[PDB]
A paper describes a structure:
Here, we show that Pseudomonas aeruginosa OprC is an outer membrane, TonB-dependent transporter that is conserved in many Proteobacteria and which mediates acquisition of both reduced and oxidised ionic copper via an unprecedented CxxxM-HxM metal binding site. As indicated by the successful structure solution, OprC contains a single bound copper and shows the typical fold of a TBDT, with a large 22-stranded β-barrel occluded by an N-terminal approximately 15 kDa plug domain that, like in other TBDTs, completely occludes the lumen of the barrel.
We next asked whether OprC also binds Cu(I). Since it is challenging to maintain copper in its +1 state during crystallisation, we used silver (Ag(I)) as a proxy for Cu(I) and determined the co-crystal structure of WT OprC in the presence of 2 mM AgNO3. This is possible because the protein used for crystallisation only had approximately 60% copper occupancy. Data were collected at 8,000 eV, at which energy the anomalous signal of copper is very small (0.6 e−, compared to 4.2 e− for Ag). Strikingly, and in sharp contrast to Cu(II), the anomalous map of OprC WT crystallised in the presence of silver shows not one but 3 anomalous peaks. The other 2 silver sites have lower occupancies (Ag2, approximately 10σ and Ag3, approximately 10σ) and are each coordinated by 3 methionines of the methionine track (Met286, Met339, and Met343 for Ag2; Met341, Met343, and Met348 for Ag3), as seen also, for example, for Cu(I) in the Ctr1 copper transporter. The distance between Ag2 and Ag3 is approximately 6.5 Å, i.e., large enough for 2 metal ions to be bound simultaneously, consistent with the fact that Ag was present at approximately 10-fold excess during crystallisation (approximately 0.2 mM OprC and 2 mM Ag). While direct measurement of the affinities of the methionine binding track sites would be challenging, the structural data suggest that the methionine track provides at least 2, and possibly more, binding sites for Ag(I), and, by extension, for Cu(I).
Residue numbers in the entry: 66 to 444, 450 to 723
Write the structure that this text describes.
């Protein structure tokens, strides 16, 4: 019953991790989706600045991860992914974060090669007329200050719910006393209206908005705006029949409006490729829906449904007349549409409870994906050879999983085969300046990515000791890979298709030593190989381990955490994704941190922490290369923060 601070999350069900994001996390997160996944073994984060990291799962990056918010899909618009999906998510506003590792589900959209991530909010359960609030404030080093509010009121028949947050930090300092360009600010406000005409019905309308700004240690530009707009409507019916346990319909609309420039959060580097004030605006409009029925009968559960999705991308730039140094901002020009994606899918999952200690699950889905290139020209300007052209493909995926509970031990074993196929996304088709060799551009030739992967592992849910492991081996056909070349002026990317082998796993245990002392540990490993070129895959996080120690008496608790990270010597220089490249073997490091928590009232709880107690100067292997405009050298990557203190108070009524 004693309050805690979360240093790491364990796996509770096979392949499935579930956590409540509202608890204090020990490497305290910069109020961003990617930082709440640091806590779960298998995740790493490309650091861009102080916030807005790009999450990497088992070495896979980007659209290989399926990031859902209330079953809806929010996607960002920057061509260089300053606004990864998780930039718009504020996790402590959500109630449940769950992660399914590997291509082992079909219920939540196409192409979840690496895994799916589901932030949800469970609906209110009001009986009498009533209300509830929970809130939190947080203050830390470097001007870090966060407010979070969650309030609802309603009764048997419906409810109003408000969720909001405001969060900011100024530039942090690394372990050497250098201050890192990394100031950020974020806010969100979202409302939900729910109507529950009887206990077998739920209709809910959601709407919300958010904005932010972020300085980027790399990049060469900063993000001055991250406008989000979201509209959602869903519909749940329970127990409509004896076999038809549930029917869920849902429709959602998301809009991202991003602005990047070099004069609002920095001053234009007078000796770069951008000495002139320049901004670029992009937006992304996303409309999509789901409809699914769950059938339960005998020893079988069956979920069948269809989903659909459209999304569109547009952009406009600034202009700088140079011999009259007059600046025309981007809002003075029209939008140029440049891409439209469509997807329609149909899916089903079947669970056979072969009684007792045996479970067998299989799913399939078939997807029709299509894109149209709307760029009339390229970037001064030249013709686009694929203007108005279209591409489509029909892509099937599916999986089988078997689960076995043992006789003696409280042990579950499991193994699964999964095949997943993913249509290339906006960044793989539109951001590279060159496609495969012999191609007119990326849009024309980049093939879908096809992943076949074997997942297996076990859980020991004993008393005193809980343990879990999950491994994976797989091959990827036509893995989409970026290469960087230096043609004198500027850097130029090239997307290609290669074949890859991948493997790895995570394991962890927590032992309850006494009634007061618990210890736990985790290990995460990833390995990747480009078979086409016989060399390592780029941007693969090195071997990582975490050891925690926690004492809890009555109302209070104290924790320690050691994070130790191996060097990464398997690299692929000048290859990577759309965001970063490999360049140098990384050094290992260890980082130590302390936290404490104390329940004052049944409504008020306190916590505090020191991150990086020993002020270690360290950089992660994945982090982006720092920009020549600031104090960063040649492919030196942005360092991690130095010692930081934080304190937090949680309220609940
Ligand atoms: Ag941008
Ligand atoms: Ag620029
Ligand atoms: Ag310019």
């Amino acid at each position: 019953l004693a309050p805690s601070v979360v240093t790491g999350v364990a796996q509770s069900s096979p392949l499935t991790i579930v956590t409540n994001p509202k608890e204090p996390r020990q490497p305290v997160p910069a109020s961003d989706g990617a930082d709440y996944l640091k806590t779960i073994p298998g995740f790493a984060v490309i650091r861009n600045g102080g916030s807005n990291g790009d999450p990497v799962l088992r070495g896979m990056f980007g659209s290989r991860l399926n990031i859902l918010t209330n079953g809806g899909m929010m996607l960002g618009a920057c061509p260089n992914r300053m606004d990864a999906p998780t930039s718009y998510i504020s996790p402590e506003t959500y109630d449940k974060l769950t992660v399914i590792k590997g291509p082992q589900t079909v219920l939540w959209g196409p192409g979840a090669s690496a895994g799916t991530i589901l932030f949800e909010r469970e609906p209110e359960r009001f009986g009498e007329l009533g209300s509830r609030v929970n809130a939190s404030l947080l203050a830390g080093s470097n001007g870090r200050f966060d407010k979070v509010l969650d309030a609802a009121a309603g009764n048997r028949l419906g409810y109003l719910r408000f969720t909001g947050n405001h969060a900011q930090s100024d530039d942090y300092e690394d372990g050497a006393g250098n201050t890192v360009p990394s100031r950020w600010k974020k806010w969100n406000g979202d409302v939900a209206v729910g109507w529950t005409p009887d206990e077998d019905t739920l209709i809910e309308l959601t709407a919300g908005k958010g904005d932010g700004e972020a300085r980027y240690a790399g990049r060469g530009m900063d993000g001055s705006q991250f406008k989000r707009e979201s509209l959602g409507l869903r519909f749940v019916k329970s127990n409509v029949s004896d076999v038809l346990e549930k029917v869920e319909a849902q429709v959602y609309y998301n809009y991202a409006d991003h602005i990047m420039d070099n004069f609002r959060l920095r001053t234009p580097d007078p000796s770069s490729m951008m000495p002139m004030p320049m901004a670029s605006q992009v937006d992304r409009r996303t409309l999509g829906g789901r409809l699914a029925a769950t059938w339960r009968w005998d020893d079988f559960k069956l979920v069948t449904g269809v989903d659909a999705m459209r999304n569109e991308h547009r952009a406009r730039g600034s202009k700088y007349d140079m011999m009259t140094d007059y600046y025309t901002d981007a809002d003075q020009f029209p939008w140029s549409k440049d891409a439209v994606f469509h997807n329609y899918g149909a899916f089903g999952e079947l669970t056979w409870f072969a009684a007792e200690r045996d479970r067998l699950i299989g799913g399939l889905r078939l997807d029709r994906a299509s894109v149209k290139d709307y760029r009339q020209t390229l970037k001064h300007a030249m013709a686009n050879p694929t203007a108005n052209d279209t591409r489509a493909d029909t892509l099937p995926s599916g999986f089988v999983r078997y689960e076995h509970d043992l006789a003696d031990s409280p042990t579950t074993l499991y193994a699964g085969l999964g095949h997943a196929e993913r249509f290339p996304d906006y960044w793989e088709l539109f951001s590279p300046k060159r496609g495969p060799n012999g191609s007119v551009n990326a849009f024309d030739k980049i093939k879908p990515e096809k992943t076949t992967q074997l997942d297996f592992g076990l859980q020991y849910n004993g008393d005193k000791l809980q343990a879990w492991a999950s491994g994976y081996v797989g091959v990827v056909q036509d893995f989409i890979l970026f290469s960087y070349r230096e043609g004198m002026m500027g850097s130029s990317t090239q997307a290609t298709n290669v074949d890859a082998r991948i493997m790895g796993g995570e394991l962890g245990a927590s032992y309850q030593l006494t009634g007061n002392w618990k210890t736990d540990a985790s290990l995460a490993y990833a390995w990747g190989k480009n078979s086409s070129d016989d060399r390592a895959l780029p941007q693969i996080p090195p071997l990582e381990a975490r050891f925690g120690l926690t004492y809890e008496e009555g109302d209070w608790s104290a924790g320690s955490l050691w994070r130790v990270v191996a060097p990464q010597n398997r690299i692929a220089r000048d290859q990577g994704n759309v965001v970063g490249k490999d360049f140098d073997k990384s050094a290992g490091f260890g980082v130590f941190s302390l936290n404490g928590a104390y329940r004052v009232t049944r409504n008020v709880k306190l916590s505090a922490g020191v991150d990086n107690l020993f002020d270690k100067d360290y950089t992660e292997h994945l982090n982006k290369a720092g920009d020549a405009g600031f104090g960063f050298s040649a492919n030196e990557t942005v360092p991690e923060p130095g010692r930081t203190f934080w304190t937090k108070v949680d309220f609940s009524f």
